[PDB]
């Protein structure tokens, strides 16, 4: 009875989506001038990791960046001078994510240890030591992003997301709507909402203040590995293991466009957006990183040069460079 | 570095100091044997951890014959294996533990499924994984004495009809070992080291040492280029 009612509600939502969509995005964007070919030359090469990098996050000053490696190191980099700024030894060898605070006071990392570790970088003593441990997840930490210097949203392999208060040391809010492992999360510019994708091929939009799921986005055929908001906070792109990326509009609540190419069958590790949002950069498992024109849906450029498989990709805050992290222990900046 | 200021030069020097520390720690890590550990609670994985030793992942660092061994226990996590299985692509060997007596015990689920035939599927899915094609697998068969008593008391024919052997401890153990070896679909690339867990710690630790030693020989030959 309840299952039949749920199916009826899903059918009603699908009918509303079908009726709502009148004009295809591709047709509307057909008349816009194409971006042609985009070529980005390597500017900086970062070495010394000596292990498969998994996570990089840009700061808001557009110069420092954090990087996570599987030797037990977080390295904080000066991107302009190539010098290493910080080298944090980690308690847990296996780290799958790393978040750099907007202020830059703290660095958050996490992984298979079920802990999210917050490191203070502005300590008077001068040694980067463990400030706060967010213990309470049942699955592996997959993504984490600071909102403020006191509140953080983390995703875990227990199908849930959590809002943790750093000073309290406990999870203020629990988000339990997904049925699969939550692989990524992205914060909007206002920070009032955050969308996260899971291993059930769906993404969900969660309200930080209220604590419930606002919207549910389906359309992928496989596990969603990456999610990032469009710069205006009204849309987000997802990349999945079915060799496709999709664009979902929060207000429209439907699949605006799909970015797929026949030759490339490998899954998308990470996705990032440019300052104008016109270009979408996705790191594939084909050892390359593709730049796709968002409106046109064509392919605008290729970033080749990572011998081992790409694991993370991030566009800086002012949009002046893109830094890619791969499993060959080399962080490459493309401009 | 004439153009660079005093602070810039000092920052470059700090970078070089960090590079030195990272190279020294990498040289330390290059002498560490990293062992993946798999199996369940019934299998007796905790027992081998206790014998060898002298929430998400349990690390049991130890030393044997001046060689550093690192064992990671991922069993505790209930998250999907596939998502983090590629994180261990740089592991010398995989120690997989099963229990010989598991076949009699059947989980009280909605449908009756043999535990041993679950462990066989788990071994198959781990062994044929693309990430671990060249990685070696050490196979530990726990609860030998209990297996002996169980096999003599109750025949093995009842679980799976295909076996036609008599109710003999050694014959049944050999059949289980050959079936597990048969599960591997790429024998030429992947050695499997099968062993019967002894009460004496030293025998099991020595067998792990020998398997790891063979893996080190294979890696050294590959670096030399003989293979």
């Amino acid at each position, epitope marked *: 009875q309840l299952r039949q009612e749920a199916e009826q509600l899903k059918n009603q939502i699908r009918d509303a989506r079908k009726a709502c969509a009148d004009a295809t995005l591709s047709q509307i964007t057909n008349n816009i001038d194409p971006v042609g070919r985009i070529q980005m030359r390597t500017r900086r090469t970062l070495r010394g990791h000596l292990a498969k990098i998994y996570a990089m996050h840009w700061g808001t000053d557009s110069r420092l960046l954090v990087s996570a490696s599987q030797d037990g190191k977080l390295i904080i980099w000066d991107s302009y001078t190539t010098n290493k700024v910080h080298a944090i030894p980690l308690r847990s060898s296996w780290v799958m994510t790393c978040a750099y605070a907007p202020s*830059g006071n703290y660095v958050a990392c996490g992984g298979l240890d079920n802990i999210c570790s917050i490191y203070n970088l502005k300590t008077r003593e001068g040694n980067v030591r463990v400030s706060r441990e967010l213990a309470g997840h049942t699955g592996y930490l997959s993504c984490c992003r600071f909102l403020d210097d006191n509140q953080i949203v983390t995703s875990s392999g227990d199908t849930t997301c959590a809002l943790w208060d750093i000073e309290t040391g406990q999870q203020t809010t629990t988000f339990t709507g997904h049925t699969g492992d939550v692989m990524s999360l992205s914060l909007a510019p206002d920070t009032r909402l955050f969308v996260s994708g899971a291993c059930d091929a769906s993404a969900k939009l969660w309200d930080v203040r209220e604590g419930m799921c606002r919207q549910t986005f389906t359309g992928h055929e496989s596990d969603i590995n990456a999610i990032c908001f469009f710069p205006n906070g009204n849309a987000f792109a997802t990349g999945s293991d079915d060799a496709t990326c999709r664009l979902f509009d929060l207000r429209a609540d439907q699949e605006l466009m799909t970015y797929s190419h026949d030759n490339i069958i490998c899954g998308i590790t990470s996705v990032s957006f440019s300052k104008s949002g016109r270009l979408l950069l996705a790191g594939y498992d084909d050892f390359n990183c593709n730049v796709w024109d968002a409106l046109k849906a064509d392919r605008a450029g290729v970033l080749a040069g990572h011998d081992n498989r790409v694991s993370c990709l991030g566009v800086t805050d002012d949009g002046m460079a893109v830094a890619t992290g791969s499993w060959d222990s080399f962080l490459k900046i493309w401009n | 570095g004439c153009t660079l200021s005093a602070e810039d030069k*000092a920052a470059v020097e700090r970078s070089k100091m960090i590079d030195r520390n990272l190279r020294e720690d990498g040289e330390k890590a290059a002498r560490e044997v990293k062992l993946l550990l798999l199996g369940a609670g019934e299998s007796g994985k905790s027992t081998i951890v206790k014998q060898m030793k002298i929430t998400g992942i349990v690390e049991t660092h130890f030393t044997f014959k001046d060689l550093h061994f690192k064992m990671f226990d991922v069993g505790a996590q209930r998250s999907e294996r596939k998502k983090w299985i590629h994180c261990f692509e740089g592991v010398t060997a995989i120690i997989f533990c099963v229990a010989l007596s598991d076949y009699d015990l059947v989980l009280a689920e909605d449908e009756e499924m043999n535990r041993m035939h679950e462990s066989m599927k788990l071994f198959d899915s781990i062994c044929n994984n693309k990430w671990f094609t060249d990685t070696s697998i050490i196979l530990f068969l726990n609860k030998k004495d209990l297996f002996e008593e169980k096999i003599k008391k109750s025949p093995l024919t009842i679980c799976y009809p295909e076996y036609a052997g008599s109710n003999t401890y050694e014959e049944a153990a050999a059949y289980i070992q050959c079936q597990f070896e048969d599960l591997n679909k790429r024998k030429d690339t992947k050695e499997i080291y099968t062993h019967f867990t002894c009460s004496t710690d030293t025998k099991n630790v020595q067998f792990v040492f020998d398997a790891v030693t063979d893996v080190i020989i294979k890696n050294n030959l590959k670096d030399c280029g003989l293979f």
Partner: single-chain antibody, 234 residues
Framework: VQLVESGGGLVQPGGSRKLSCSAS????????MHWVRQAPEKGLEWVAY????????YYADTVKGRFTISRDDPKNTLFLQMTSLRSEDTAMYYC??????????????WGQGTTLTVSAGSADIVMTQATSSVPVTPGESVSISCRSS???????????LYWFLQRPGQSPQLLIYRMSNLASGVPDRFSGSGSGTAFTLTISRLEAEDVGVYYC?????????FGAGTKLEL
């Protein structure tokens, strides 16, 4: 974070003396160290620097060859060996910890000072404190001017000017590092402004406690040269 120096007392000219500074409550091995001298009734003066890990060492030319700086990291101790002392070395010597990276605050923490009494540079940038004393009342905003002999604006664009405050009878503290960033723990009363060769410190809503000797330092190239020192009074 604490630094205490020992080895003071009277010395005869031409003798030798070893000072030692013991550091507690911080990662001594990761900080570069400075020795800075202060004449009895005159401004401060930079003596020497040793990087973290001892990779680079700098000395003032007046003390070049006579003074030897060294550090022992397992004991967290800084040593200064002084041979053939002269009558100009009767000064109070401070130890300074400094870390160098993007966004770091070097010269943030100052030692306590060991007094030593020896009882009987055209290329280098010169810092010009134009005034010497300014009489002030608690509450008014006060401006202090400093000048340089060379443009302190590097190609990167970060000015290498530091503003320090020495209270009467106390160690000097860092106030502003790089002329645009306040040092951690300094109230927002202080602000730095200006351009190459002309620099200004503005103290809005001043307090009696704030009053002290203000020093402007360049940090473009070695040897470091300090300013004369603008004193405030009541």
């Amino acid at each position: 974070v604490q630094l205490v120096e020992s080895g003071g007392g009277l010395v005869q000219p031409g003798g030798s003396r070893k000072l030692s500074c013991s550091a507690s409550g911080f990662a001594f091995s990761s900080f570069g160290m400075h020795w800075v001298r202060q004449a009895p009734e005159k401004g401060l003066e930079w003596v020497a620097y040793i990087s973290s890990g001892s990779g680079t060492i700098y000395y003032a030319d007046t003390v070049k060859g006579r003074f030897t700086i060294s550090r022992d990291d397992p004991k967290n101790t800084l040593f200064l060996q002084m041979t053939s002392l002269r009558s100009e070395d009767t000064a109070m010597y401070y130890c300074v910890r400094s870390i160098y990276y993007y966004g770091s605050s070097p010269f943030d923490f100052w030692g306590q000072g060991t007094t030593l009494t020896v009882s009987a540079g055209s290329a280098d940038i010169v810092m010009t404190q134009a005034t010497s004393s300014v009489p002030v009342t608690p509450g008014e905003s006060v401006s202090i001017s400093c000048r340089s002999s060379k443009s302190l604006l590097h190609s990167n664009g970060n000015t290498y000017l530091y503003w320090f405050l020495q209270r009467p009878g106390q160690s000097p503290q860092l106030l502003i590092y790089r002329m645009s960033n306040l040092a951690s723990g300094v109230p927002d009363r202080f602000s730095g402004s200006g351009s190459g060769t002309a620099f200004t410190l503005t103290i809005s809503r001043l307090e009696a406690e704030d009053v002290g000797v203000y020093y402007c330092m360049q940090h473009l190239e070695y040897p470091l040269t300090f300013g004369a020192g603008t004193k405030l009074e009541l």
